[PDB]
Design a binder for these strands. Sequence first.
RNA 1: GUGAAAUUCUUGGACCGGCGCAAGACGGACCAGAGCGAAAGCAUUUGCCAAGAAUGUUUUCAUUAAUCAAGAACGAAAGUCGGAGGUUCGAAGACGAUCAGAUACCGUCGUAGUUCCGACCAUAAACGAUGCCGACCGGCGAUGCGGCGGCGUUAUUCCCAUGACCCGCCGGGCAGCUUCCGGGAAACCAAAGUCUUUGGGUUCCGGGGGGAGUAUGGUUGCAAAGCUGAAACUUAAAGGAAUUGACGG
RNA 2: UAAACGGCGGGAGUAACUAUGACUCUCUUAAGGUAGCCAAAUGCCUCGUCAUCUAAUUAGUGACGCGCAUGAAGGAUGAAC
Lengths: 107, 91, 102, 150, 83, 98, 24, 149, 129
Amino acid sequence: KTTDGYLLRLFCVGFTKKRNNQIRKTSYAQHQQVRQIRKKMMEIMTREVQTNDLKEVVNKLIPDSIGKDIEKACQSIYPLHDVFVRKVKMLKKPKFELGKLMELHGE
Amino acid sequence: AKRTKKVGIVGKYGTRYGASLRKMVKKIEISQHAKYTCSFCGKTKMKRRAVGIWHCGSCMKTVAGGAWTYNTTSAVTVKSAIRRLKELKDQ
Amino acid sequence: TKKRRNNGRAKKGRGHVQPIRCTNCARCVPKDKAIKKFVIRNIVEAAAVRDISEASVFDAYVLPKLYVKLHYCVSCAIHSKVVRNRSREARKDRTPPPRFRP
Amino acid sequence: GRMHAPGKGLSQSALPYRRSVPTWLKLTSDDVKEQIYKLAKKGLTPSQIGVILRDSHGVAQVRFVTGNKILRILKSKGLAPDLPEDLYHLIKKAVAVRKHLERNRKDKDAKFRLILIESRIHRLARYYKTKRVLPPNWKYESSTASALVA
Amino acid sequence: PLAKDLLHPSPEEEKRKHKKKRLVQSPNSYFMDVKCPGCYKITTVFSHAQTVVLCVGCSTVLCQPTGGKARLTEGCSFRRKQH
Amino acid sequence: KSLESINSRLQLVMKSGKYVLGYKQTLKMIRQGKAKLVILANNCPALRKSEIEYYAMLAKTGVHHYSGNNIELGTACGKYYRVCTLAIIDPGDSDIIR
Amino acid sequence: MRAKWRKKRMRRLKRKRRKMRQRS
Amino acid sequence: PGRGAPLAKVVFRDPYRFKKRTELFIAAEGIHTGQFVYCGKKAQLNIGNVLPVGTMPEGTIVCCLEEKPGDRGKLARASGNYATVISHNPETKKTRVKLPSGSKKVISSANRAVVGVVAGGGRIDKPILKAGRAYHKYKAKRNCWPRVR
Amino acid sequence: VRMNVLADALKSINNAEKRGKRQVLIRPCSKVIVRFLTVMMKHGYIGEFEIIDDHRAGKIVVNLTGRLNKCGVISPRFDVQLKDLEKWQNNLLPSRQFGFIVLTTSAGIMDHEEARRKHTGGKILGFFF
RNA sequence: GUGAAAUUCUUGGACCGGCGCAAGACGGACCAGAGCGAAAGCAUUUGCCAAGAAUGUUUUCAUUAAUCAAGAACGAAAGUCGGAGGUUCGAAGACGAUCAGAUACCGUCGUAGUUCCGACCAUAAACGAUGCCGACCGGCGAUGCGGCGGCGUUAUUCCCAUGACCCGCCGGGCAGCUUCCGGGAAACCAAAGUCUUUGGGUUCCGGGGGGAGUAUGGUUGCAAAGCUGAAACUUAAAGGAAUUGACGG
RNA sequence: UAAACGGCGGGAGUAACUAUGACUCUCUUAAGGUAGCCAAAUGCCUCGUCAUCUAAUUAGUGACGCGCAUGAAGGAUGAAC
Ligand SMILES: [Mg+2]
Ligand SMILES: [Mg+2]
Ligand SMILES: [Mg+2]
Ligand SMILES: [Mg+2]
Ligand SMILES: [Mg+2]
Ligand SMILES: [Mg+2]
Ligand SMILES: [Mg+2]
Ligand SMILES: [Mg+2]
Ligand SMILES: [Mg+2]
Ligand SMILES: [Mg+2]
Ligand SMILES: [Mg+2]
Ligand SMILES: [Mg+2]
Ligand SMILES: [Mg+2]
Ligand SMILES: [Mg+2]
Ligand SMILES: [Mg+2]
Ligand SMILES: [Zn+2]
Ligand SMILES: [Zn+2]
């Protein structure tokens, strides 16, 4: 839930990255590593939405900075390369304040 | 010695009412007349008084339960669901 | 006679493998037995790439790809000629056919 | 291979050829015996006593340094457990599995493991009754075993 | 090699072989003197210790049990016992 | 880990320390002031639980609410009867820290 | 015939035989 | 007599005069004698409590539901039966619920209900097996049983 | 589990001989194995063998001279009388000019020729030729 | 929708596009000659509950073990019984096509079933058509787990730890390539080898093809059926692996 | 929509002795009576035909089935009464 009452469902994806000098064909993360990565990238999607408004949520998912910091944080478990917030959907909306709509559009 | 091969408690019904109906009523009668462990005093003295009413002989606690069993699986799942919805409702 | 050492499938240390439906006839095939082709095709024909480029409102527009994984029972695979029968010695190799880059 | 598993592992302990006590061990036989007595009073089973003694006090083999095994020392002093350690742990595991099973009726895997554990219990009890460690009339009852462990 | 000398294997293969599969069994573990900084006494610790070894004169941990070998806490010194 | 640890510590209080099982004897020990720990099953009647807690507050002794019931506390004590309240005169095994 | 269909035919015949004998 | 659901005799305090008020609630399954039940808007979600449907979550189920906001319970009263609170809308003060027949009903959010399922379990599971048992069943209800085609 | 230590050792020696190795290592040692190997060594079918002594059952390293054809075992140690020793001999041996049958007797572990020489029977152990 | 059609739905707005709602299934791609489990089998997230192999061990007991008639637990799918649920698919059934006929293959619809809970059944090409325990007998490169040792790259940090790679060693696994180890009728198999140079322990089980897994008896099951299981009579072959030819919608 | 009321067909030819008709033609229906069961408390012809029971049976039972006019929420069984 955002600060202004917008509830969002965020879906993030990441893919394990093979090293440049890697000879092994596959780059598989173990189950505990995957679980730690998932927990990390859930708890660093929560705090970028809980403490800020929908406007500065949208403007920071425009460059997908959330995915970039997720990828930066997860390098200590297993490297990831293609990390994005794959999807977000609106679940509930707060009453449609026309003043909020107009300040989102204009100033 | 063992007195009946399979009828058990529905041996009182004789040859009547049909084998499948006697088999169906057998487990219900067993659960109806079974004594359950009281969850309040810990004794195995909780038995049915009337349909849906289960009384404990020792602590004299009366509970609303199922018709033939002390509690129904429906009611157990309901209690768990209500607990989950209450803990979701509050924070 | 036992035709293949692997019995025509990749199941080695498993009891059961979930089935999938053939993309051609919807036959239930074990997943490790079905012939899989991962086709990555231009979403437009190589004849029409120039027309789409001319009609594009953009200048440096990269045409999208189309990513489809196809599963075949061996019957449809043989009928569609993605796989072919081979000699007794030639059945034993697993190297995929060359891409023919030049 | 394993008794009740299709495993053929080799992880063991390689006792060294030198049975002599190391020269850097300042603990004497009575000192090690007193340490075993203190740990047994604290409640440790002989396996745990040996593990603690090897890890912390630097003694390699209680038998090598004292001439007697840990269970022999405990029985001589008169504080060995009434049940053997391994039988006690098997009964404890069986009680835990039964407690899980009486709530999870669909855990047929747990039922299978319970059968394996109880078979091991009965074979070990047969061995102990043969060796007269256990009373000749000793029997493992699933109903009354829960009060013996934990 | 039909004429490998089984009686006298060199220490390189004698060490690479499994502990049980050696000519004579030899444990791969050992005992170590451990020095905790800020303390004077010396602790004798098993290399593959399964328990957290603690000093009696200081509320400090010396080793943490792992899968194969006890990981010594940083700042601690150690030496072998008689090879 | 807490439940198995308290079960093992109770097992070692038995056979090695002085205890007493039951409501009347527990109250008698508390008012003699020699009960160092009182364990109550969650099955305990609420009035009895409150009264024993008040007695323990008066006697400056600890109360542990066992996460079992009277049947399971009897099993943990190793008896074949239900125990709902119990007291430990002296542990002998560091269940009660000095 | 296919062995499976011979098995099915035999099962049908066996049910008929059981019915005939039970009738007696 | 005549119903399969047990009844719960529950005693309240009169808020306006020194007196005890005895009610005859339909016993939700799980309640026992000596238990405290709580009735009102601020009551919590527990088996046996009575509180308005509008204050209940989107998946809770209820026992003695009011058809109208202010009468006593009217729905899901027969043994083993329950209704489900499906949906709400804070505007218009309406709540959609599912009845034991499977029908969907829109009621006021102020309608009260007992949390839980009514006791009496699967009474219809047991075969009656006897014309005499049917006779004793309907003798406590009304003159309807021996039915001539 | 291993139930016939002598059988395992004899099979190991036979396999190493067939493969052409110069030395063979047999892991479970026993007095019966040492006596069998001593009989074979006195008859010249094997070279010197050395016993590695651990505190457990020792191991044996045998020098194979390359002149062994088979060193099998007769696992059920049948009672062999002097009246049926000839039948055992022409059932197990390639010829009457060579080949030996080792049987454990009251006088010790020894070959059938010495058993007949000192007029005693015993239990069958194995054979080698 | 099909090879082509047609049954069918459609100016009542069918199909298509958009926004929602509801229900029940199903967990794609990642997904592999990869893992786990006694097999059957197991793939959305998170939590709880017990369980487990392998590894490490200078821990403990000290032969407590292997295989096992009788007996016992589990046992895909289909099927049976009771209660919920029933979206899709779809035995039976109906219709349209095809055809000489077409009770089918193809298409439209559709019952039981398919889903969940509880109780039965105990069967599959339940397959590796290949008993378990133990020892020995070639090479090689990989892979999964655990442990051990090493140039270096990388993650933060100030350094080591700890992860991700790289190079090896060890043990237990799924396998693969290769080989005049050897075996085999051969196909092939590092086991289906260590077998006339025949004996490691032990369980089940076959004796030409049919009749026949039939009859009868017994026993289990609600039923369907499961287990045990003949004889008369008939027959000179039936089969396995490979070779050549002929033929192939 | 039939566990609503109810309903659920004919005529010809055809197998290496005859005899039947697996099979094939057509006409027609809303669908052409399926699983079963039968001279049945339901079959006219009829005291049907065959077997058994008797010295002798229009009776009984078992079997057959183009059944005037059997048949499925009722059909067929099956202890006890
Ligand atoms: Mg073929
Ligand atoms: Mg299978
Ligand atoms: Mg009537
Ligand atoms: Mg099934
Ligand atoms: Mg059903
Ligand atoms: Mg359909
Ligand atoms: Mg054997
Ligand atoms: Mg035969
Ligand atoms: Mg209809
Ligand atoms: Mg008919
Ligand atoms: Mg008739
Ligand atoms: Mg008549
Ligand atoms: Mg007469
Ligand atoms: Mg008749
Ligand atoms: Mg007939
Ligand atoms: Zn009670
Ligand atoms: Zn296909």
